[PDB]
From Swiss-Prot:
Protein name: Myoglobin
Chain sites annotated for binding heme b: 94
Record flagged with keyword Nucleotidyltransferase: no
Catalysis performed (reactions): Fe(III)-heme b-[protein] + nitric oxide + H2O = Fe(II)-heme b-[protein] + nitrite + 2 H(+); H2O2 + AH2 = A + 2 H2O
Gene name for this UniProt entry: MB
GO cellular component term of the entry, any: extracellular exosome
Listed EC numbers: 1.7.-.-, 1.11.1.-
Keyword Phosphoprotein set for record: yes
Keyword terms: Cytoplasm, Heme, Iron, Metal-binding, Muscle protein, Oxidoreductase, Oxygen transport, Phosphoprotein, Transport
Length: 154
């Protein structure tokens, strides 16, 4: 798929807001993910033991990782589709070392879209949400093709 420049602008306009507080957005997103789809939490051996949302909130490690994850996503979105180099090391660790099914990357995409909608309603109307969704579908499609080249999905 190919996003137009107008779609990329909408995606990079709300991302610039996210970057004013990367650690807070990373927290919100991972928690949303773990509350919604608790099975995803089992993939994290470092966090697995967290029992409540108050425990998740207070985990410094969880917050640091959310910054790591968002920063990597942010560097991929700023490429505007030319992200093959960035995608390689990420598809290799998630498919071979962590073992994250595509289905889970759909669950976090939903969590990202939920959180941006809540925090940024003015910069995340229907057209901007459709453009972010398009950018994440692209990301998933490219990641899934890489998984297949690496021997993991399908
Ligand atoms: C927006 C998509 C995602 C991005 C950009 C992302 C990015 C990253 C980055 C940059 C790291 C550290 C370096 C490495 O291990 O590759 C990481 C580690 C990890 N990721 Fe992701 N990830 C994504 C989705 C997920 C999902 C959906 C799951 C699981 C349900 C997952 C599970 C993990 C685990 C288990 C680690 C290791 C955590 C620790 O260090 O122990 N990731 N991810």
């Amino acid at each position: 798929m190919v996003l137009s420049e107008g779609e990329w602008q909408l995606v990079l306009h709300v991302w610039a807001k996210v970057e004013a507080d990367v650690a807070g957005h990373g927290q919100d997103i991972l928690i949303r993910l773990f509350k919604s789809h608790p099975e995803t939490l089992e993939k994290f051996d470092r966090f697995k033991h967290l029992k409540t949302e108050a425990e998740m909130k207070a985990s410094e490690d969880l917050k640091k990782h959310g910054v790591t994850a968002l920063t990597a996503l942010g560097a991929i979105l700023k490429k505007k589709g030319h992200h093959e180099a960035e995608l390689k090391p990420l598809a290799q660790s998630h498919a071979t070392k962590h073992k994250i099914p595509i289905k889970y990357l759909e669950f976090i995409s939903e969590a990202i879209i939920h959180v941006l909608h809540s925090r940024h309603p003015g910069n995340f109307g229907a057209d901007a949400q459709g453009a972010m969704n398009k950018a994440l579908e692209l990301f998933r499609k490219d990641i899934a093709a890489k998984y297949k080249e690496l021997g993991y999905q399908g």
